[PDB]
Amino acid sequence: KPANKLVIVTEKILLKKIAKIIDESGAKGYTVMNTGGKGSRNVRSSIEANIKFEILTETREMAEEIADRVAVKYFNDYAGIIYICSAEVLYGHTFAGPEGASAWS
Amino acid sequence: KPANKLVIVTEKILLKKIAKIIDESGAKGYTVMNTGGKGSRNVRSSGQPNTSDIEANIKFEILTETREMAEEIADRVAVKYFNDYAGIIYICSAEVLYGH
Amino acid sequence: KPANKLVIVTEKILLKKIAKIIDESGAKGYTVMNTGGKGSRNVRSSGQPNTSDIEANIKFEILTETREMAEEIADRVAVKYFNDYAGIIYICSAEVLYG
Ligand SMILES: Nc1ncnc2c1ncn2[C@@H]1O[C@H](COP(=O)(O)OP(=O)(O)OP(=O)(O)O)[C@@H](O)[C@H]1O
Ligand SMILES: Nc1ncnc2c1ncn2[C@@H]1O[C@H](COP(=O)(O)OP(=O)(O)OP(=O)(O)O)[C@@H](O)[C@H]1O
Ligand SMILES: Nc1ncnc2c1ncn2[C@@H]1O[C@H](COP(=O)(O)OP(=O)(O)OP(=O)(O)O)[C@@H](O)[C@H]1O
Ligand SMILES: [Cl-]
Ligand code: NA
Ligand code: NA
Ligand code: NA
């Protein structure tokens, strides 16, 4: 089943702030990694101080909503880039099926 | 050469268990990273990890010989472990330039 | 805008050397992670890493301007280092949204 994989590479200090935006979007979760890096926007600069989020979204609209909120709220003032990859989910939130009367477990 | 990039994000304590499945599948290698995260299945036995905890999880990336190999790995991980452990599995398309 | 995401997984000791290759290609930046791993080339001079060692390797992700730039980096790294050093290099398609 196709899904958008939204990636946000940004400053570590934004971790909780971005996790709240992701949650508010309706996305079921996110994965976050510590990283290093170098950029050319030269907002932060010309240890690892980055974080990388990967968020598998329900729709393209969901991914765009997260992206647009993060970028508008933070990217004039903080380093970061955002991009999307195409993914196909094999086992996701629905691993054990729906809840309620259509449940199979 | 086009390839399937299988991604398994799961509890860090499954590292050796998932490496065993990968090895047994015929896959030629894997890359693994520490991560944090949050999900909605709420099956981690110890609850959601701290937001600061960027080693609750591991992420495997496995460039597989075929699509069927990636699915074999996914299916065995999931049936063996995902009722008792947190985790998700997806695939991305990759073109291998060198290595592999 | 429709970009290439070039991925280089290789021995951590090559961090500075590959960063220089990336910078000389004209790439606007890169992201680098520690990783563990296993492969089948069996080139790494110190043998396979411990399953628990999640710092044997580095993984670079480079969003490039063109496919030509991605290829320049890849070819440079492999040709100069892959006889002697472990690693793999691949490309994923990415669409940059905020960039
Ligand atoms: N072309 C790219 N490929 C991969 N990662 C990138 C690229 N450009 C930027 N990054 C990642 O995004 C981070 C932020 O870069 P950005 O250009 O937004 O800000 P910057 O102030 O130049 O960053 P830095 O202080 O890291 O130099 C970088 O540290 C890096 O991890
Ligand atoms: N939509 C998603 N996008 C990206 N990563 C996700 C997503 N859903 C879950 N994950 C990753 O999978 C891991 C496990 O989530 P899952 O839903 O399987 O179990 P959980 O018990 O709810 O996990 P957690 O205790 O981490 O909240 C998460 O910690 C996260 O790294
Ligand atoms: N099929 C693959 N899928 C994902 N990552 C891989 C794959 N094959 C190799 N790698 C990554 O590339 C690294 C080096 O593997 P390579 O085959 O180049 O050399 P190696 O000497 O066999 O490496 P190692 O000592 O790690 O076994 C691995 O540690 C792993 O991170
Ligand atoms: Cl990663
Ligand atoms: Na910079
Ligand atoms: Na959860
Ligand atoms: Na090996």
CSV table of N, CA, C and O and ligand atoms in Angstrom, one decimal, chain A residues 8-11 35-46 49-51 75 78-83, chain C residues 4-6 22 27-32 60-65 96 98-99, ligand 1:
chain,number,residue,atom,x,y,z
A,8,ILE,N,12.3,15.1,7.5
A,8,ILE,CA,12.7,16.4,8.0
A,8,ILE,C,14.0,16.3,8.7
A,8,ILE,O,14.2,15.6,9.7
A,9,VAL,N,15.0,17.0,8.2
A,9,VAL,CA,16.3,17.1,8.8
A,9,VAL,C,16.4,18.5,9.4
A,9,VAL,O,16.4,19.5,8.6
A,10,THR,N,16.6,18.6,10.7
A,10,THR,CA,16.6,19.8,11.3
A,10,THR,C,17.4,19.8,12.6
A,10,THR,O,18.1,18.9,13.0
A,11,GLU,N,17.3,20.9,13.4
A,11,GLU,CA,18.1,21.1,14.6
A,11,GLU,C,17.5,20.3,15.7
A,11,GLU,O,16.2,20.3,15.9
A,35,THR,N,21.8,12.8,13.8
A,35,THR,CA,22.6,12.9,12.7
A,35,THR,C,23.6,14.1,12.8
A,35,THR,O,23.4,15.0,13.7
A,36,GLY,N,24.5,14.2,11.9
A,36,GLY,CA,25.3,15.3,11.7
A,36,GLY,C,25.1,15.8,10.2
A,36,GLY,O,24.3,15.2,9.5
A,37,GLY,N,25.7,16.9,9.9
A,37,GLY,CA,25.5,17.4,8.5
A,37,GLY,C,26.1,18.7,8.3
A,37,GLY,O,26.6,19.3,9.2
A,38,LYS,N,26.0,19.1,7.0
A,38,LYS,CA,26.4,20.4,6.6
A,38,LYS,C,25.3,20.9,5.6
A,38,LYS,O,24.8,20.1,4.9
A,39,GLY,N,25.0,22.2,5.6
A,39,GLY,CA,24.1,22.7,4.6
A,39,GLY,C,24.6,24.0,4.0
A,39,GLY,O,25.7,24.4,4.3
A,40,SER,N,23.8,24.5,3.1
A,40,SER,CA,24.2,25.8,2.4
A,40,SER,C,23.2,26.9,2.7
A,40,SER,O,23.4,28.0,2.2
A,41,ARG,N,22.1,26.7,3.4
A,41,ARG,CA,21.2,27.8,3.7
A,41,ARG,C,21.9,28.8,4.6
A,41,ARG,O,21.6,30.0,4.6
A,42,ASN,N,22.8,28.3,5.5
A,42,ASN,CA,23.7,29.1,6.4
A,42,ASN,C,22.8,30.0,7.3
A,42,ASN,O,23.1,31.2,7.5
A,43,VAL,N,21.8,29.3,7.9
A,43,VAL,CA,21.0,30.0,8.9
A,43,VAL,C,21.7,29.7,10.3
A,43,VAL,O,21.9,30.6,11.1
A,44,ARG,N,22.0,28.4,10.6
A,44,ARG,CA,22.7,28.1,11.8
A,44,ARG,C,24.2,28.3,11.8
A,44,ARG,O,24.9,28.7,12.8
A,45,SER,N,24.8,28.0,10.6
A,45,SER,CA,26.3,28.1,10.5
A,45,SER,C,26.7,28.1,9.0
A,45,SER,O,26.0,27.5,8.1
A,46,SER,N,27.8,28.8,8.7
A,46,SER,CA,28.5,28.7,7.4
A,46,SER,C,29.7,27.7,7.6
A,46,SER,O,30.7,28.0,7.0
A,49,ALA,N,24.4,17.7,15.8
A,49,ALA,CA,23.4,18.7,16.3
A,49,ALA,C,22.1,18.6,15.4
A,49,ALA,O,21.2,19.5,15.6
A,50,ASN,N,22.0,17.5,14.6
A,50,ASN,CA,20.8,17.4,13.9
A,50,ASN,C,20.0,16.2,14.4
A,50,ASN,O,20.5,15.2,15.0
A,51,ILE,N,18.7,16.4,14.0
A,51,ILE,CA,17.8,15.2,14.0
A,51,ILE,C,17.2,15.1,12.7
A,51,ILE,O,16.9,16.0,11.9
A,75,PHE,N,11.6,27.5,9.7
A,75,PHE,CA,12.8,27.4,8.8
A,75,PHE,C,13.4,28.8,8.4
A,75,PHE,O,14.4,28.8,7.8
A,78,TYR,N,15.7,28.6,11.9
A,78,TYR,CA,16.5,27.4,12.2
A,78,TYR,C,16.8,26.7,10.9
A,78,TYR,O,16.2,26.9,9.9
A,79,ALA,N,18.0,26.0,10.9
A,79,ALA,CA,18.4,25.2,9.8
A,79,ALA,C,17.4,24.0,9.6
A,79,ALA,O,16.8,23.5,10.5
A,80,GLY,N,17.3,23.5,8.4
A,80,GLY,CA,16.6,22.3,8.1
A,80,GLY,C,16.2,22.2,6.6
A,80,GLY,O,16.1,23.2,5.9
A,81,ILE,N,16.0,20.9,6.2
A,81,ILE,CA,15.4,20.7,4.9
A,81,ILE,C,14.3,19.6,5.1
A,81,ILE,O,14.3,18.9,6.0
A,82,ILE,N,13.4,19.6,4.1
A,82,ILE,CA,12.3,18.7,4.1
A,82,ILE,C,12.2,18.1,2.7
A,82,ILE,O,12.2,18.8,1.7
A,83,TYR,N,12.0,16.8,2.6
A,83,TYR,CA,11.8,16.1,1.4
A,83,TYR,C,10.8,14.9,1.6
A,83,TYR,O,10.7,14.4,2.7
C,4,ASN,N,17.8,13.6,-6.6
C,4,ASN,CA,18.4,12.4,-6.3
C,4,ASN,C,18.9,12.4,-4.9
C,4,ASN,O,19.5,13.4,-4.5
C,5,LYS,N,18.6,11.4,-4.1
C,5,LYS,CA,19.2,11.2,-2.8
C,5,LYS,C,20.2,10.1,-2.9
C,5,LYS,O,19.9,8.9,-3.0
C,6,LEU,N,21.4,10.6,-2.9
C,6,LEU,CA,22.5,9.6,-3.0
C,6,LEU,C,22.9,9.1,-1.6
C,6,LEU,O,23.0,9.9,-0.6
C,22,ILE,N,32.3,15.2,-1.4
C,22,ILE,CA,31.0,15.7,-1.5
C,22,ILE,C,31.1,17.2,-1.7
C,22,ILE,O,30.4,17.8,-2.6
C,27,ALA,N,27.9,19.8,-4.2
C,27,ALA,CA,26.7,19.5,-3.5
C,27,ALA,C,26.5,20.5,-2.4
C,27,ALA,O,27.5,21.0,-1.8
C,28,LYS,N,25.2,20.9,-2.1
C,28,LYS,CA,25.0,22.0,-1.3
C,28,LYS,C,25.0,21.6,0.2
C,28,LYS,O,25.1,22.4,1.1
C,29,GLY,N,25.0,20.3,0.5
C,29,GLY,CA,25.1,19.8,1.8
C,29,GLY,C,25.1,18.3,1.9
C,29,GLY,O,25.1,17.6,0.9
C,30,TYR,N,25.1,17.8,3.1
C,30,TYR,CA,25.0,16.3,3.3
C,30,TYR,C,24.5,16.1,4.8
C,30,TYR,O,24.7,16.9,5.6
C,31,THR,N,23.9,14.9,5.0
C,31,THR,CA,23.5,14.4,6.3
C,31,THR,C,24.3,13.1,6.6
C,31,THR,O,24.4,12.3,5.7
C,32,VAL,N,24.8,13.0,7.8
C,32,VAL,CA,25.6,11.8,8.1
C,32,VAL,C,25.2,11.2,9.4
C,32,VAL,O,24.9,11.9,10.3
C,60,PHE,N,26.1,8.5,4.7
C,60,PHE,CA,25.9,9.9,4.1
C,60,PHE,C,24.6,9.8,3.3
C,60,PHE,O,24.4,8.8,2.5
C,61,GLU,N,23.8,10.9,3.4
C,61,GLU,CA,22.7,11.1,2.5
C,61,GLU,C,22.9,12.5,1.9
C,61,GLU,O,23.1,13.5,2.6
C,62,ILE,N,22.9,12.5,0.6
C,62,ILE,CA,23.3,13.8,-0.1
C,62,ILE,C,22.2,14.0,-1.1
C,62,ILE,O,22.0,13.3,-2.1
C,63,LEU,N,21.4,15.1,-1.0
C,63,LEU,CA,20.4,15.5,-2.0
C,63,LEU,C,21.1,16.3,-3.0
C,63,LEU,O,21.6,17.4,-2.7
C,64,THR,N,21.2,15.8,-4.2
C,64,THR,CA,22.1,16.5,-5.2
C,64,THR,C,21.2,17.3,-6.1
C,64,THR,O,20.1,17.0,-6.3
C,65,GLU,N,21.9,18.3,-6.8
C,65,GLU,CA,21.4,19.2,-7.8
C,65,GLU,C,20.9,18.5,-9.1
C,65,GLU,O,19.9,18.7,-9.6
C,96,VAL,N,12.1,17.4,-3.1
C,96,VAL,CA,12.4,18.4,-2.1
C,96,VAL,C,11.2,19.4,-1.9
C,96,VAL,O,10.7,20.0,-2.9
C,98,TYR,N,11.2,21.8,0.9
C,98,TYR,CA,11.7,23.0,1.6
C,98,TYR,C,13.2,22.7,1.7
C,98,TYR,O,13.6,21.7,2.2
C,99,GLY,N,13.9,23.6,1.1
C,99,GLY,CA,15.1,23.2,0.2
C,99,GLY,C,16.0,24.3,-0.1
C,99,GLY,O,17.1,24.4,0.6
D,1,LIG,N1,21.7,18.9,-0.1
D,1,LIG,C1,21.6,18.2,1.0
D,1,LIG,N2,21.7,16.9,1.2
D,1,LIG,C2,21.5,16.3,2.4
D,1,LIG,N3,21.3,16.9,3.6
D,1,LIG,C3,21.3,18.3,3.5
D,1,LIG,C4,21.4,19.0,2.3
D,1,LIG,N4,21.3,20.3,2.6
D,1,LIG,C5,21.1,20.4,3.9
D,1,LIG,N5,21.1,19.2,4.5
D,1,LIG,C6,20.9,18.8,5.9
D,1,LIG,O1,20.1,19.8,6.5
D,1,LIG,C7,20.8,20.4,7.6
D,1,LIG,C8,20.5,21.9,7.6
D,1,LIG,O2,21.0,22.5,6.5
D,1,LIG,P1,20.5,24.0,6.1
D,1,LIG,O3,21.1,24.3,4.7
D,1,LIG,O4,19.1,24.1,6.3
D,1,LIG,O5,21.1,24.9,7.2
D,1,LIG,P2,22.6,25.5,7.5
D,1,LIG,O6,22.4,26.6,8.6
D,1,LIG,O7,23.5,25.7,6.3
D,1,LIG,O8,23.1,24.1,8.2
D,1,LIG,P3,24.4,23.7,8.9
D,1,LIG,O9,24.6,24.6,10.1
D,1,LIG,O10,24.3,22.2,9.1
D,1,LIG,O11,25.5,24.1,7.9
D,1,LIG,C9,22.3,20.1,7.3
D,1,LIG,O12,23.1,20.1,8.5
D,1,LIG,C10,22.2,18.7,6.7
D,1,LIG,O13,22.0,17.7,7.7
